[PDB]
Coordinates of C-alpha atoms in Angstrom, one line a residue:
Chain B
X1112 CA 111.2 104.4 125.8
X1113 CA 112.7 106.5 123.1
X1114 CA 112.3 108.5 120.3
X1115 CA 110.3 107.2 117.6
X1116 CA 110.4 106.1 114.2
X1117 CA 108.3 108.5 112.8
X1118 CA 108.8 111.2 115.1
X1119 CA 112.4 111.3 114.0
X1120 CA 111.7 110.6 110.3
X1121 CA 109.9 114.3 110.5
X1122 CA 113.6 115.8 110.9
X1123 CA 114.2 113.3 107.4
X1124 CA 114.3 114.8 104.2
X1125 CA 113.0 112.6 101.1
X1126 CA 114.8 111.3 97.8
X1127 CA 112.3 112.6 95.2
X1128 CA 112.4 111.2 91.8
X1129 CA 111.2 113.0 88.5
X1130 CA 107.8 111.7 87.6
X1131 CA 108.0 108.1 85.9
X1132 CA 105.9 108.2 82.4
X1133 CA 105.4 104.4 81.7
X1134 CA 104.6 105.1 77.8
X1135 CA 107.6 105.8 76.9
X1136 CA 109.1 103.8 74.3
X1137 CA 112.6 103.3 73.1
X1138 CA 111.3 104.5 69.5
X1139 CA 113.6 102.2 67.4
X1140 CA 112.1 103.6 64.2
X1141 CA 113.3 107.1 64.6
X1142 CA 116.9 106.3 66.1
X1143 CA 117.0 103.6 62.5
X1144 CA 115.7 106.0 59.9
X1145 CA 118.2 108.7 57.9
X1146 CA 116.9 112.2 58.2
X1147 CA 117.4 115.0 55.5
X1148 CA 116.6 119.0 56.0
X1149 CA 114.0 120.6 54.4
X1150 CA 115.2 124.5 53.4
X1151 CA 111.4 125.6 53.1
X1152 CA 109.5 123.3 53.9
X1153 CA 108.8 121.6 50.5
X1154 CA 110.8 118.3 49.5
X1155 CA 110.3 117.5 45.3
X1156 CA 110.8 114.1 44.6
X1157 CA 112.1 114.1 40.5
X1158 CA 112.0 110.4 39.1
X1159 CA 113.1 108.6 35.8
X1160 CA 110.1 107.9 33.5
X1161 CA 109.4 104.5 32.5
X1162 CA 112.8 103.1 34.2
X1163 CA 116.8 108.5 25.7
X1164 CA 116.3 109.2 29.9
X1165 CA 113.3 111.2 30.5
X1166 CA 112.2 112.5 33.7
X1167 CA 108.3 112.6 34.8
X1168 CA 106.6 116.3 34.6
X1169 CA 104.3 116.1 37.9
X1170 CA 106.9 114.4 40.5
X1171 CA 105.4 114.1 44.2
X1172 CA 106.1 117.2 46.8
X1173 CA 106.6 116.4 50.4
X1174 CA 105.0 119.5 52.7
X1175 CA 106.5 119.1 56.2
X1176 CA 103.6 119.5 58.6
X1177 CA 103.1 121.3 62.1
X1178 CA 101.9 119.3 65.2
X1179 CA 101.9 122.0 68.5
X1180 CA 100.9 121.9 72.1
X1181 CA 100.4 124.8 74.4
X1182 CA 102.2 123.8 78.1
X1183 CA 100.5 125.9 80.8
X1184 CA 102.0 126.6 84.1
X1185 CA 100.7 128.7 86.8
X1186 CA 103.2 131.2 87.9
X1187 CA 102.9 130.4 91.5
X1188 CA 103.4 126.4 90.7
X1189 CA 106.9 127.1 88.8
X1190 CA 107.5 130.3 91.3
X1191 CA 107.2 128.4 94.7
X1192 CA 107.8 124.8 94.1
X1193 CA 111.3 124.6 91.5
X1194 CA 113.4 123.2 94.4
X1195 CA 115.4 120.7 93.5
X1196 CA 113.7 119.8 90.2
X1197 CA 112.2 122.6 87.9
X1198 CA 109.1 122.8 87.3
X1199 CA 108.7 124.0 83.3
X1200 CA 111.6 121.8 82.9
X1201 CA 109.9 118.6 83.8
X1202 CA 106.3 119.7 82.5
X1203 CA 108.3 120.2 79.1
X1204 CA 110.2 116.9 79.0
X1205 CA 107.1 114.8 79.6
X1206 CA 105.0 117.0 77.0
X1207 CA 107.8 116.6 74.1
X1208 CA 108.3 112.5 75.4
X1209 CA 104.2 112.3 74.8
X1210 CA 105.0 114.2 71.2
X1211 CA 107.5 112.4 69.9
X1212 CA 106.0 109.2 70.3
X1213 CA 102.8 110.6 68.5
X1214 CA 105.6 111.5 66.1
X1215 CA 106.8 107.9 65.9
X1216 CA 103.0 106.7 65.3
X1217 CA 102.7 109.1 62.5
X1218 CA 105.7 108.4 60.6
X1219 CA 104.1 104.7 60.6
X1220 CA 100.6 105.1 60.6
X1221 CA 99.6 109.2 59.1
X1222 CA 97.5 108.6 56.1
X1223 CA 99.5 111.6 54.1
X1224 CA 102.9 110.1 54.4
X1225 CA 103.4 107.2 56.3
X1226 CA 104.6 103.6 55.4
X1227 CA 101.9 101.3 55.9
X1228 CA 99.9 103.8 53.4
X1229 CA 102.7 105.0 51.2
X1230 CA 103.1 101.2 49.9
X1231 CA 103.9 100.4 46.2
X1232 CA 101.2 97.8 44.8
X1233 CA 103.7 94.8 44.1
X1234 CA 104.9 95.6 46.8
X1235 CA 102.5 94.4 49.2
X1236 CA 102.9 90.4 50.7
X1237 CA 99.9 88.3 52.4
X1238 CA 100.6 85.4 54.9
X1239 CA 100.0 81.7 53.6
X1240 CA 98.4 80.6 56.6
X1241 CA 97.7 83.8 59.2
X1242 CA 100.9 83.4 61.6
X1243 CA 104.3 85.1 60.5
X1244 CA 106.5 81.6 59.4
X1245 CA 109.8 82.1 57.8
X1246 CA 108.5 81.6 54.2
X1247 CA 106.6 85.0 54.7
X1248 CA 109.7 86.5 56.0
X1249 CA 111.5 85.3 52.8
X1250 CA 108.8 86.9 50.6
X1251 CA 109.4 90.4 51.9
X1252 CA 113.2 89.9 51.5
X1253 CA 112.4 89.0 48.5
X1254 CA 110.5 92.1 47.5
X1255 CA 113.3 94.1 49.3
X1256 CA 116.2 91.8 47.9
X1257 CA 118.4 95.0 47.5
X1258 CA 119.6 96.0 50.3
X1259 CA 117.1 95.6 53.6
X1260 CA 117.9 97.5 56.7
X1261 CA 115.4 95.8 59.3
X1262 CA 111.9 94.4 59.8
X1263 CA 109.8 96.4 61.9
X1264 CA 107.0 94.2 63.6
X1265 CA 104.7 95.2 67.0
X1266 CA 106.3 93.2 69.6
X1267 CA 103.7 90.0 69.7
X1268 CA 104.1 89.7 66.1
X1269 CA 107.8 89.2 67.0
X1270 CA 106.6 86.7 69.3
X1271 CA 105.0 84.8 67.0
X1272 CA 107.4 84.8 64.6
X1273 CA 109.7 83.0 66.9
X1274 CA 107.1 80.2 68.0
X1275 CA 106.8 79.5 64.2
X1276 CA 110.6 79.3 64.4
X1277 CA 110.4 77.2 67.2
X1278 CA 108.3 74.3 65.9
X1279 CA 110.7 74.2 63.0
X1280 CA 114.0 73.2 64.1
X1281 CA 115.2 76.7 63.3
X1282 CA 117.2 78.7 66.1
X1283 CA 117.0 82.4 64.7
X1284 CA 120.1 84.6 65.1
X1285 CA 120.1 87.5 67.8
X1286 CA 122.1 90.9 67.2
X1287 CA 122.7 93.5 69.9
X1288 CA 122.2 96.9 68.9
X1289 CA 121.8 100.0 71.2
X1290 CA 122.5 97.9 73.9
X1291 CA 119.0 95.5 73.5
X1292 CA 118.8 92.3 71.8
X1293 CA 116.6 91.7 68.8
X1294 CA 115.7 88.9 66.1
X1295 CA 117.3 87.9 62.8
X1296 CA 115.9 86.4 59.7
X1297 CA 118.6 85.9 57.2
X1298 CA 120.6 88.9 58.7
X1299 CA 117.7 91.5 58.7
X1300 CA 117.0 92.5 62.2
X1301 CA 113.0 92.3 63.6
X1302 CA 112.4 95.8 65.3
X1303 CA 109.9 96.2 67.8
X1304 CA 107.4 99.3 67.9
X1305 CA 103.7 99.1 69.8
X1306 CA 102.5 101.5 66.9
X1307 CA 102.1 99.2 64.8
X1308 CA 98.4 98.2 64.4
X1309 CA 96.7 95.6 66.3
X1310 CA 93.2 94.8 65.8
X1311 CA 92.0 91.1 67.1
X1312 CA 95.6 89.7 66.2
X1313 CA 96.3 90.4 62.8
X1314 CA 98.9 93.0 62.7
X1315 CA 101.4 93.9 60.1
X1316 CA 105.0 93.6 59.3
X1317 CA 107.1 95.9 57.0
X1318 CA 110.6 96.0 55.9
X1319 CA 112.7 98.4 55.2
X1320 CA 115.9 100.1 53.1
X1321 CA 116.6 103.3 54.4
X1322 CA 119.4 106.0 53.0
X1323 CA 119.2 108.9 50.7
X1324 CA 122.1 107.3 48.7
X1325 CA 120.5 104.2 47.9
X1326 CA 117.2 105.6 47.1
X1327 CA 115.3 104.2 50.4
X1328 CA 113.5 105.9 52.8
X1329 CA 114.4 109.0 54.6
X1330 CA 112.8 111.3 57.0
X1331 CA 112.1 114.6 56.3
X1332 CA 112.6 117.6 59.2
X1333 CA 113.2 121.5 58.9
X1334 CA 116.2 122.5 60.4
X1335 CA 116.9 126.4 61.7
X1336 CA 114.2 126.8 63.7
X1337 CA 113.2 129.7 66.5
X1338 CA 113.6 128.0 70.1
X1339 CA 115.0 125.0 68.4
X1340 CA 115.1 122.5 71.4
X1341 CA 116.1 119.7 69.1
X1342 CA 115.8 118.2 65.6
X1343 CA 112.4 119.6 63.9
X1344 CA 111.5 120.7 67.3
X1345 CA 111.1 124.3 69.0
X1346 CA 109.7 125.5 72.2
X1347 CA 108.4 129.2 72.8
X1348 CA 107.5 131.2 75.5
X1349 CA 103.8 132.4 74.6
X1350 CA 103.1 135.0 76.8
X1351 CA 100.9 135.3 80.4
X1352 CA 97.2 135.3 80.7
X1353 CA 95.4 137.2 83.7
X1354 CA 94.6 134.5 85.9
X1355 CA 98.3 134.2 86.0
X1356 CA 99.0 131.1 83.0
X1357 CA 102.2 131.0 81.6
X1358 CA 102.1 129.2 78.4
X1359 CA 104.5 127.9 75.9
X1360 CA 104.3 126.5 72.4
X1361 CA 106.1 122.8 71.5
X1362 CA 106.4 122.7 67.7
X1363 CA 107.4 119.3 65.8
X1364 CA 107.7 119.8 62.2
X1365 CA 108.1 116.1 59.9
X1366 CA 107.5 113.9 57.2
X1367 CA 108.9 111.0 55.4
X1368 CA 109.8 110.0 51.8
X1369 CA 109.7 106.4 49.9
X1370 CA 112.2 107.4 47.3
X1371 CA 112.0 104.5 44.9
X1372 CA 109.1 101.9 45.4
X1373 CA 111.2 98.6 45.5
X1374 CA 112.5 100.3 49.4
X1375 CA 109.7 99.2 51.3
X1376 CA 107.4 96.2 51.7
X1377 CA 104.5 95.2 53.8
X1378 CA 103.3 91.5 54.9
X1379 CA 99.9 92.2 55.7
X1380 CA 97.5 89.8 57.5
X1381 CA 99.7 88.1 60.0
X1382 CA 98.0 86.2 62.7
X1383 CA 99.7 86.5 66.6
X1384 CA 97.2 84.6 68.0
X1385 CA 98.2 80.9 66.9
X1386 CA 99.7 78.3 69.8
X1387 CA 101.4 75.0 68.6
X1388 CA 100.0 71.8 71.0
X1389 CA 103.4 70.0 70.8
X1390 CA 102.6 66.5 71.0
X1391 CA 105.3 63.3 71.1
Chain R
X22 CA 92.4 136.0 58.6
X23 CA 95.8 136.0 57.8
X24 CA 98.4 135.4 55.2
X25 CA 97.6 131.9 53.5
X26 CA 100.1 128.9 53.4
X27 CA 99.9 128.7 49.5
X28 CA 100.5 132.3 49.0
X29 CA 103.5 132.2 51.7
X30 CA 104.6 129.1 50.1
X31 CA 104.6 131.1 46.6
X32 CA 108.0 132.7 48.5
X33 CA 109.9 129.7 49.3
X34 CA 112.2 127.2 47.2
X35 CA 111.6 123.5 47.1
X36 CA 114.1 120.8 47.3
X37 CA 114.6 119.2 44.1
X38 CA 116.3 115.5 44.1
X39 CA 118.4 114.0 41.3
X40 CA 116.0 111.5 39.2
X41 CA 115.7 108.4 40.9
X42 CA 116.1 105.4 38.6
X43 CA 114.1 102.1 39.7
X44 CA 116.4 99.7 37.9
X45 CA 119.6 100.7 39.6
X46 CA 120.9 96.9 41.1
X47 CA 124.3 96.7 43.2
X48 CA 125.2 94.8 40.8
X49 CA 127.4 92.5 43.0
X50 CA 129.1 90.2 40.6
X51 CA 130.7 92.7 39.0
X52 CA 132.3 93.9 42.1
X53 CA 133.3 90.3 43.0
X54 CA 135.2 89.8 39.5
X55 CA 139.0 90.5 38.7
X56 CA 139.5 92.7 36.1
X57 CA 142.7 92.2 34.0
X58 CA 143.9 94.8 31.5
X59 CA 144.4 93.9 27.7
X60 CA 146.7 96.2 26.2
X61 CA 144.9 96.3 22.6
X62 CA 141.9 94.3 22.6
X63 CA 143.1 90.8 22.3
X64 CA 143.4 88.1 24.8
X65 CA 145.0 85.0 24.0
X66 CA 144.6 81.7 26.8
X67 CA 147.1 79.3 26.6
Chain C
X177 CA 108.5 76.2 77.3
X178 CA 110.2 78.2 74.7
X179 CA 106.9 79.9 74.3
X180 CA 106.3 80.5 78.2
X181 CA 109.7 82.8 77.8
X182 CA 108.7 84.4 74.7
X183 CA 105.3 85.4 76.7
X184 CA 108.0 87.0 79.4
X185 CA 109.8 88.8 76.8
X186 CA 106.4 90.1 75.1
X187 CA 105.8 91.9 78.9
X188 CA 109.2 93.2 78.9
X189 CA 109.4 93.8 75.4
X190 CA 111.4 97.3 76.1
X191 CA 114.7 96.8 77.2
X192 CA 115.1 93.2 79.2
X193 CA 118.1 92.4 81.1
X194 CA 117.8 89.2 82.4
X195 CA 115.8 85.8 83.7
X196 CA 116.2 85.3 86.7
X197 CA 115.1 81.2 87.8
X198 CA 116.0 78.4 90.4
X199 CA 119.0 76.3 88.5
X200 CA 116.2 73.5 88.3
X201 CA 114.0 75.5 86.3
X202 CA 117.1 76.4 84.1
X203 CA 117.9 72.7 83.6
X204 CA 113.6 72.6 83.1
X205 CA 113.9 74.9 79.9
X206 CA 116.8 73.2 79.1
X207 CA 115.5 69.6 78.7
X208 CA 112.2 71.2 76.7
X209 CA 114.6 73.5 74.5
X210 CA 116.4 69.9 73.8
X211 CA 112.6 68.1 73.5
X212 CA 112.2 70.4 70.0
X213 CA 115.1 71.0 68.3
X214 CA 116.7 73.9 69.6
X215 CA 120.0 74.2 71.5
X216 CA 119.8 77.4 73.1
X217 CA 122.8 79.9 73.2
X218 CA 125.3 80.3 75.9
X219 CA 127.0 83.6 77.3
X220 CA 129.9 84.3 79.7
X221 CA 129.5 86.8 82.2
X222 CA 131.6 87.1 85.5
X223 CA 133.7 84.5 84.4
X224 CA 130.7 81.8 84.4
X225 CA 128.6 80.0 81.6
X226 CA 124.9 81.2 81.4
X227 CA 121.9 79.9 79.4
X228 CA 120.0 82.7 77.3
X229 CA 117.1 83.1 75.1
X230 CA 116.5 86.0 72.4
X231 CA 119.7 87.4 73.9
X232 CA 118.1 87.8 77.6
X233 CA 120.1 85.3 79.8
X234 CA 118.9 83.1 82.7
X235 CA 120.5 84.1 85.6
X236 CA 120.3 81.0 88.6
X237 CA 119.1 82.1 92.3
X238 CA 118.5 79.0 94.5
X239 CA 116.4 81.8 96.6
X240 CA 114.0 81.9 93.7
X241 CA 111.2 79.7 95.9
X242 CA 110.6 76.2 94.9
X243 CA 107.9 73.9 96.6
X244 CA 107.0 70.4 95.4
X245 CA 108.4 71.5 91.6
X246 CA 106.3 74.6 91.0
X247 CA 108.9 77.2 90.7
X248 CA 108.6 80.8 89.0
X249 CA 110.9 82.7 86.4
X250 CA 111.3 86.4 86.6
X251 CA 112.1 88.9 83.7
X252 CA 113.4 92.5 84.8
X253 CA 114.5 95.6 83.5
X254 CA 116.9 97.1 85.6
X255 CA 118.4 100.9 85.6
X256 CA 117.5 104.4 87.1
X257 CA 117.6 105.7 83.6
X258 CA 115.5 103.1 82.1
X259 CA 112.5 103.0 84.6
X260 CA 113.8 100.0 85.5
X261 CA 114.6 98.1 88.8
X262 CA 116.8 100.3 91.1
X263 CA 118.1 98.8 94.4
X264 CA 118.4 101.4 97.3
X265 CA 120.8 101.3 100.2
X266 CA 122.4 103.9 102.9
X267 CA 125.3 106.0 101.8
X268 CA 127.3 107.2 104.4
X269 CA 127.2 105.0 107.6
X270 CA 129.4 104.8 110.9
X271 CA 131.6 101.6 110.7
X272 CA 130.4 101.8 106.9
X273 CA 131.9 98.0 105.9
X274 CA 130.3 98.4 102.3
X275 CA 127.7 99.3 100.4
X276 CA 124.6 99.6 103.1
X277 CA 127.0 98.0 105.9
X278 CA 128.3 99.2 108.9
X279 CA 130.1 97.2 112.0
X280 CA 130.5 98.3 115.0
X281 CA 131.7 97.4 118.3
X282 CA 129.2 97.3 121.1
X283 CA 131.8 97.0 124.4
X284 CA 132.3 93.9 127.0
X285 CA 130.4 92.2 129.2
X286 CA 130.9 90.8 133.4
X287 CA 131.7 87.5 131.3
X288 CA 134.5 88.8 128.6
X289 CA 132.1 88.5 126.1
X290 CA 133.2 91.0 123.2
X291 CA 130.1 92.0 121.1
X292 CA 129.9 93.5 117.5
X293 CA 126.6 95.1 115.3
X294 CA 126.7 94.4 111.9
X295 CA 123.9 96.5 110.7
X296 CA 122.5 95.9 106.6
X297 CA 120.5 98.7 105.4
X298 CA 118.6 98.3 102.0
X299 CA 115.2 98.5 99.7
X300 CA 114.1 98.0 96.3
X301 CA 111.9 100.0 94.0
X302 CA 110.2 98.7 90.7
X303 CA 110.0 102.4 89.0
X304 CA 107.7 101.5 86.4
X305 CA 104.8 98.2 86.2
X306 CA 106.3 97.3 83.1
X307 CA 109.8 96.7 84.2
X308 CA 109.3 93.2 85.7
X309 CA 107.1 90.2 84.3
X310 CA 106.9 86.8 86.1
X311 CA 106.1 83.7 84.6
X312 CA 104.1 81.6 87.0
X313 CA 103.4 77.8 88.0
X314 CA 106.4 76.2 86.2
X315 CA 107.1 72.8 86.7
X316 CA 110.9 71.1 87.0
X317 CA 110.1 67.1 87.5
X318 CA 109.2 66.6 83.7
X319 CA 111.2 64.6 81.6
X320 CA 110.7 63.5 78.1
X321 CA 110.7 59.7 77.0
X322 CA 112.4 59.4 73.6
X323 CA 111.3 57.2 71.7
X324 CA 112.6 56.3 67.8
Chain Q
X1296 CA 104.2 109.3 88.9
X1297 CA 102.5 110.5 85.9
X1298 CA 98.8 110.1 86.3
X1299 CA 97.1 108.0 83.1
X1300 CA 99.8 108.0 81.2
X1301 CA 97.9 117.9 80.1
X1302 CA 100.5 116.2 82.4
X1303 CA 99.7 115.3 85.4
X1304 CA 101.4 113.9 88.9
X1305 CA 99.9 111.6 91.4
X1306 CA 99.6 113.2 94.5
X1307 CA 100.3 109.9 97.0
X1308 CA 103.2 108.5 95.4
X1309 CA 104.8 105.4 97.1
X1310 CA 108.0 105.9 99.3
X1311 CA 109.7 103.4 100.0
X1312 CA 111.4 103.5 103.6
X1313 CA 115.1 101.3 104.2
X1314 CA 114.9 98.6 106.6
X1315 CA 117.6 97.5 109.0
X1316 CA 118.6 93.9 110.1
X1317 CA 121.0 93.4 112.7
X1318 CA 123.0 91.0 114.1
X1319 CA 124.8 90.8 117.2
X1320 CA 128.4 88.5 116.9
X1321 CA 129.9 87.4 120.4
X1322 CA 133.6 86.7 120.7
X1323 CA 134.8 85.6 123.9
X1324 CA 138.3 88.0 124.6
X1325 CA 140.3 84.7 125.5
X1326 CA 139.3 83.4 122.5
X1327 CA 140.8 86.4 120.5
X1328 CA 143.5 86.9 122.5
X1329 CA 145.0 83.5 122.6
Chain A
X192 CA 93.2 122.9 83.4
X193 CA 96.7 122.5 84.1
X194 CA 99.0 120.8 87.0
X195 CA 97.5 121.3 90.1
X196 CA 99.0 122.8 93.6
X197 CA 99.6 119.5 95.8
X198 CA 100.6 117.4 92.3
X199 CA 103.3 119.9 92.1
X200 CA 104.5 120.3 95.9
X201 CA 104.5 116.3 95.5
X202 CA 108.2 117.5 93.9
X203 CA 109.2 120.3 96.4
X204 CA 111.6 120.0 99.7
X205 CA 110.0 121.3 102.8
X206 CA 111.9 123.4 105.2
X207 CA 112.6 121.2 108.5
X208 CA 113.3 123.2 111.6
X209 CA 115.2 121.6 114.4
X210 CA 112.3 120.4 117.7
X211 CA 111.4 123.7 119.1
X212 CA 111.2 123.0 123.0
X213 CA 109.4 125.9 124.6
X214 CA 110.4 125.2 128.5
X215 CA 113.8 127.3 127.3
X216 CA 114.3 130.3 129.3
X217 CA 117.1 132.7 129.1
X218 CA 118.6 131.5 132.7
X219 CA 119.5 134.8 133.9
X220 CA 121.1 133.3 136.8
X221 CA 123.8 131.5 135.6
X222 CA 124.8 133.9 133.3
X223 CA 125.2 136.7 136.5
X224 CA 126.9 134.8 138.9
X225 CA 130.8 134.5 139.3
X226 CA 132.2 130.3 138.9
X227 CA 135.4 129.6 140.5
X228 CA 136.6 125.9 139.8
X229 CA 137.4 123.2 142.1
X230 CA 140.4 121.2 141.3
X231 CA 138.6 118.1 143.5
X232 CA 135.3 119.0 144.1
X233 CA 136.1 119.9 147.8
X234 CA 135.6 123.9 148.7
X235 CA 136.4 124.7 152.3
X236 CA 136.0 128.7 153.1
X237 CA 137.6 129.5 155.9
Chain O
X480 CA 108.1 120.4 118.2
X481 CA 109.2 118.7 121.0
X482 CA 106.1 116.6 122.5
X483 CA 104.8 117.9 126.3
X484 CA 107.5 120.1 126.4
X485 CA 113.4 111.2 127.1
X486 CA 113.0 113.8 124.6
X487 CA 110.2 113.1 121.8
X488 CA 108.6 115.1 118.9
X489 CA 105.4 115.8 118.0
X490 CA 104.4 113.4 114.4
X491 CA 101.9 116.0 112.9
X492 CA 104.0 119.4 113.0
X493 CA 102.1 122.5 111.2
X494 CA 103.3 122.8 108.0
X495 CA 103.4 126.8 107.0
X496 CA 102.7 127.2 103.1
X497 CA 103.9 130.5 101.4
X498 CA 101.0 132.2 99.8
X499 CA 100.5 134.0 96.4
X500 CA 99.0 137.5 95.8
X501 CA 99.1 138.9 92.1
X502 CA 98.2 142.6 90.3
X503 CA 97.6 143.1 86.7
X504 CA 98.9 146.3 85.6
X505 CA 97.6 147.5 82.6
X506 CA 99.4 150.6 80.3
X507 CA 98.5 151.8 77.0
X508 CA 101.5 151.8 74.8
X509 CA 100.8 155.3 73.8
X510 CA 100.5 156.4 76.9
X511 CA 104.4 155.2 77.9
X512 CA 105.4 155.8 74.8
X513 CA 104.2 159.8 74.0
Chain V
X817 CA 128.5 104.6 127.2
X818 CA 128.0 101.7 124.7
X819 CA 125.2 99.6 122.4
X820 CA 122.8 96.9 124.0
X821 CA 121.1 94.0 122.2
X822 CA 118.9 96.4 121.1
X823 CA 120.9 98.3 119.3
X824 CA 120.2 101.2 121.2
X825 CA 123.3 103.6 121.8
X826 CA 123.4 105.2 125.4
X827 CA 125.1 108.7 125.6
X828 CA 125.9 109.9 129.2
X829 CA 125.3 113.4 130.1
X830 CA 127.0 114.6 133.7
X831 CA 126.8 118.0 135.2
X832 CA 129.0 119.1 138.1
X833 CA 127.8 122.5 140.3
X834 CA 127.2 123.9 143.6
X835 CA 126.8 127.4 145.3
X836 CA 129.1 129.2 148.1
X837 CA 127.7 132.7 150.0
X838 CA 131.1 133.5 151.2
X839 CA 129.7 136.2 153.8
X840 CA 126.3 136.1 155.5
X841 CA 125.6 139.7 154.3
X842 CA 126.1 138.5 150.6
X843 CA 122.2 138.0 150.4
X844 CA 118.9 138.8 151.8
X845 CA 115.3 137.7 151.0
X846 CA 112.5 139.6 151.3
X847 CA 109.6 136.9 152.5
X848 CA 105.8 136.5 152.1
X849 CA 105.4 138.4 148.9
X850 CA 101.8 138.2 147.4
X851 CA 101.7 139.0 143.6
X852 CA 97.7 138.9 142.8
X853 CA 96.3 142.2 144.5
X854 CA 95.5 144.8 142.0
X855 CA 94.4 148.6 142.7
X856 CA 90.7 150.2 141.7
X857 CA 91.8 153.9 140.8
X858 CA 88.9 156.5 141.3
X859 CA 88.9 159.7 140.9

């Protein structure tokens, strides 16, 4: 009889990983948009009227919104247990990941800004049969014919479009972006995002042109911040309370502007639950 | 009670864009053609 | 069929890396693609050619079980930074002939037999549960009859 | 892991223990010598 | 509610000591004796 | 620890967790300023 | 020492020692010592 494995293992270090969060998504939309800074939180979009050259006297103004999160860490937890991983660093890291997921969801779904609410009449298409066939994406490409950048859809909507393509003889082309593969139609890629709503089937598909110089969609952030951990993001120390809880404030300032109304189109009423029966 | 948002906003600059025209098109045809100069406004094709 | 691989690509939509299947499962997928009008795209990796679907290649491995037909197909995302699948090895070894591998001399017995010990240390961790999906109950013994 | 993904962690994370496999290779000394 | 102590402790290294043996004695006698070397294991006292 | 002191170790050694004690010291700003 | 078929590595620890009393008046022993006696102090 010799030394055991558990007894010997009592003298060994384990390799501890930082906590893993399964809700982290690649957040493609934030990576694909162009971001313009807004010096003091107000952004006025002037327009030619009825496009002599006249301007409208009541242009829309976009006010940057603020979202906050208080991160509380006991001082004994950070004082004692910060080796080899900093406790406050990981706490704030996971907080900021969750906050940026919420930020992408609000870029798509907010009621003030947000693509699915700021789509002009005439830029809204409906499916003919329910499933997203190639004809529907050609309708979308008609609405944003000028210089489309990408499609935005739920991954299940992308799978439904692929099934429709496979029912026809068409294999859609594929491209590589950010080290990942995406499906394209007529050269405009389909970008996945689980933040696009999906309720009993019945999702939506978007087509965007991005850029300030092309009069497309632009994101808006606040450039100079105290703390300033990122683009429109700040972390600040709030203080310590009587129970020895140290608090941190995380603030994120963002908005979104569609510069001209033909920069965005939405295909509505997309059904993702249809499967073909192949019989030969 | 503290300073309001509208009252504080009275002291802030807005970022004003140049007017946006929705009828601007990429005008591909003008970009694709070859252009030859005509010295005095007359061009004879023999 | 292609719809099954699209289901798999739904489950691992984030950043899929490759499919893993038996070579007969890859041939069955190719036959299904040929029954439809779709010729699947091909890529070259390590000097060898592989079949891809929506940009994610199908990797052959005879180690994937196969019993009376009825194999399985896997879809993986790999990498520690992406919270995918990672392999685990023991870095510093006596002998150390490779990654997690050691060869050591054991001795010589009374019959003049020299013995060597070869040791291999390994494991595997799936960091988040949406880094791996498995398509189950795949049949590789079906052939289409083409009649015109 | 983050629990139910404030940010909490699970108190019983999985631990992976590396496994060992061995093989003894026997060679006669006359076979290698000659 | 904030992060717990056990959950936070999951990310911390423990300081592990070498095993402690309670039968270790100072062994004074070995320290107090004089030791002479014996070249080939035999020592004759005349 | 060595068990029952071959050489074996105990599989449930005692672990000492450092404890924290706190005290809040309040000083009026006029008392320190003046 | 080597490694066996079950992958056990063995080590041999050897200790060589002895002791010599050179003359017989170099060592004396007091025998039959009792350590269990306690005095009762009464004043």
